[PDB]
Design an enzyme around this catalytic site. Structure first.
Site, PDB file in Angstrom:
ATOM      1  N   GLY A 174       3.066  15.994  19.744  1.00  0.00           N
ATOM      2  CA  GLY A 174       2.452  16.291  21.042  1.00  0.00           C
ATOM      3  C   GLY A 174       2.344  15.096  21.973  1.00  0.00           C
ATOM      4  O   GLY A 174       2.742  13.982  21.613  1.00  0.00           O
ATOM      5  N   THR A 183      -0.392  13.412  23.278  1.00  0.00           N
ATOM      6  CA  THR A 183      -1.317  12.353  22.855  1.00  0.00           C
ATOM      7  C   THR A 183      -0.707  11.484  21.753  1.00  0.00           C
ATOM      8  O   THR A 183      -0.809  10.258  21.786  1.00  0.00           O
ATOM      9  CB  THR A 183      -2.675  12.924  22.399  1.00  0.00           C
ATOM     10  OG1 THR A 183      -3.143  13.866  23.374  1.00  0.00           O
ATOM     11  CG2 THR A 183      -3.719  11.807  22.233  1.00  0.00           C
ATOM     12  N   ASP A 233      -3.112  12.680  14.397  1.00  0.00           N
ATOM     13  CA  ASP A 233      -2.619  13.807  15.182  1.00  0.00           C
ATOM     14  C   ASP A 233      -3.617  14.200  16.268  1.00  0.00           C
ATOM     15  O   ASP A 233      -4.793  13.826  16.206  1.00  0.00           O
ATOM     16  CB  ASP A 233      -2.362  15.002  14.255  1.00  0.00           C
ATOM     17  CG  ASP A 233      -1.362  16.003  14.827  1.00  0.00           C
ATOM     18  OD1 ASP A 233      -0.865  15.813  15.963  1.00  0.00           O
ATOM     19  OD2 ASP A 233      -1.058  16.982  14.110  1.00  0.00           O
ATOM     20  N   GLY A 234      -3.139  14.948  17.265  1.00  0.00           N
ATOM     21  CA  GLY A 234      -3.991  15.524  18.307  1.00  0.00           C
ATOM     22  C   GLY A 234      -4.512  16.909  17.948  1.00  0.00           C
ATOM     23  O   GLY A 234      -4.402  17.350  16.806  1.00  0.00           O
ATOM     24  N   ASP A 271      -5.643  21.026  19.979  1.00  0.00           N
ATOM     25  CA  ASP A 271      -5.825  21.864  21.153  1.00  0.00           C
ATOM     26  C   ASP A 271      -7.300  22.039  21.455  1.00  0.00           C
ATOM     27  O   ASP A 271      -7.704  21.986  22.617  1.00  0.00           O
ATOM     28  CB  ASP A 271      -5.128  23.210  20.963  1.00  0.00           C
ATOM     29  CG  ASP A 271      -3.630  23.055  20.754  1.00  0.00           C
ATOM     30  OD1 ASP A 271      -3.008  22.275  21.505  1.00  0.00           O
ATOM     31  OD2 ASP A 271      -3.068  23.699  19.846  1.00  0.00           O
ATOM     32  N   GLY A 297       1.770  23.724  20.834  1.00  0.00           N
ATOM     33  CA  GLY A 297       3.050  23.398  21.444  1.00  0.00           C
ATOM     34  C   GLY A 297       4.162  23.450  20.432  1.00  0.00           C
ATOM     35  O   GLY A 297       5.269  23.903  20.730  1.00  0.00           O
ATOM     36  N   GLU A 355       2.200  20.142  10.449  1.00  0.00           N
ATOM     37  CA  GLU A 355       0.952  19.435  10.750  1.00  0.00           C
ATOM     38  C   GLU A 355      -0.136  19.759   9.726  1.00  0.00           C
ATOM     39  O   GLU A 355      -0.825  18.859   9.238  1.00  0.00           O
ATOM     40  CB  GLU A 355       0.459  19.749  12.170  1.00  0.00           C
ATOM     41  CG  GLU A 355       1.276  19.063  13.257  1.00  0.00           C
ATOM     42  CD  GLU A 355       0.911  19.486  14.676  1.00  0.00           C
ATOM     43  OE1 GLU A 355       0.091  20.406  14.866  1.00  0.00           O
ATOM     44  OE2 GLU A 355       1.463  18.882  15.618  1.00  0.00           O
ATOM     45  N   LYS A 374     -10.491  18.563  25.357  1.00  0.00           N
ATOM     46  CA  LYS A 374     -10.264  19.324  24.119  1.00  0.00           C
ATOM     47  C   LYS A 374     -11.582  19.658  23.424  1.00  0.00           C
ATOM     48  O   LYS A 374     -11.610  20.483  22.510  1.00  0.00           O
ATOM     49  CB  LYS A 374      -9.347  18.568  23.144  1.00  0.00           C
ATOM     50  CG  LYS A 374      -8.053  17.990  23.717  1.00  0.00           C
ATOM     51  CD  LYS A 374      -7.334  18.946  24.642  1.00  0.00           C
ATOM     52  CE  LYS A 374      -5.828  18.957  24.426  1.00  0.00           C
ATOM     53  NZ  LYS A 374      -5.204  17.658  24.061  1.00  0.00           N
TER      54      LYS A 374
END
Ligand SMILES: O=C[C@H](O)CO
Ligand code: NA
EC number: 5.3.1.6
Lengths: 218, 218
Positions: A29, A31, A81-82, A84, A97, A103, A121
């Protein structure tokens, strides 16, 4: 607006947790894109990289990192990781996405998961962002029916295919006040590969860039 | 071919349940091979055919049946398939032929599931035949480790890729006294696509050919 600057801030802060020689796991993603660029400052500590997508893998290989299959790596020391959405208990919605299944696998196989987010978020209750569910194509219609019965509004992402060869259903209208319970129920539906609730194994740490460019660590 | 004769016997008996015009679901394997063969006697009753494997689809189309994707078929009226093990509550171990995922999906979408077995598949406790688990490839080793904590002995099935592009772990040493519980907990493991315990939705009818060539209905 400075959403990109906030993303970069959260990513730069997270990378500082790379303090020893590790097997690093990398999310997917926008970020995470800033995180990947920052990793060039930690080449002395990044022994092995595991990637959650081909997009991330492409970006990491371009920067000279040796990306290996998780089976060869065994376990991830630190996964970054980012997300949502993130609620008050570090339970996430992820997979908007791309990359939901890999993930979640990376998180499962990681000793520590750091989630990096900008303030937009941050929520109290999960659900406003639609819940992604990766499903076996043949089971798409059956699964959509079962989600209706759960109170959700399923939508097929027509013409989207994951890098696992699967399709995605987005679930709208859900108020997810019990993430543990709903993640469990969705796992029981035949044909579901992965759902985007990360609650049974939540983030260990959340690094949030605030609207004022401060860092808050959950 | 004594066992082959028993399997043909069970399949012929199941086919007799095709009494009205139905959406038929077809399983996978040698027992089902005899059922597919028998389907030429029931042409006028079979409007729609849904297949659980590419292997079965080739066979069904070789005999001039129209194989229809489950998404536009909707709901299966009658699903007929074999099993690796059947206990006393019509709870099954399936996936020896590597088609467990689509078979499980077909069962979920089926109004009636008829399981056809010879007597060698009849057990009191599931698990002596290794439990197959379809697994996202990158998650293989991670899942193997989790299975060990459940008291299992996971073995990667060499040189086998499913119709869904996934790998199989066969799990030895489990004494599955509570198939409903184990099926539920394996569904919770990240990267698991399908496990081969068919218990939360068991068979509705089991047709068993005994060693003395009789038919026992469970
Ligand atoms: O084909 C062999 C087994 O019956 C799979 O369930
Ligand atoms: Na699953």
């Amino acid at each position: 607006n400075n959403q990109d600057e906030l993303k970069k801030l959260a990513a730069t802060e997270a990378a500082k947790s790379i303090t020893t020689e590790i097997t690093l796991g990398v999310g997917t993603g926008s970020t995470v894109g800033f995180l990947i660029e920052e990793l060039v400052n930690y080449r002395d500590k990044i022994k092995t990289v595991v990637s959650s997508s081909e997009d991330s893998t492409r970006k990491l290989k371009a920067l000279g990192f040796d990306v290996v299959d998780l089976n060869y790596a065994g376990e991830i020391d630190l996964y970054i990781d980012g997300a949502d959405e993130c609620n008050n208990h570090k339970e996430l919605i992820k997979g908007g996405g791309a990359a939901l299944t890999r993930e979640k696998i990376c998180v499962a196989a990681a000793k520590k998961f750091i989630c990096i987010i900008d303030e937009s978020k941050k929520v109290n209750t999960l659900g406003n962002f639609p819940l992604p569910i990766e499903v076996i194509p043949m089971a798409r219609s059956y699964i959509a029916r079962q989600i209706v019965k759960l109170g959700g509004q399923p939508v097929y992402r027509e013409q989207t295919i994951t890098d696992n060869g699967n399709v995605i259903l987005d679930v709208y209208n859900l108020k997810i006040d019990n993430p543990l319970k709903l993640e469990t129920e969705l796992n029981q539906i035949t044909g579901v590969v992965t759902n985007g609730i990360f609650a049974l194994k939540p983030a260990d740490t959340v690094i949030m860039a605030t609207k004022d460019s401060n860092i808050v660590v959950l």
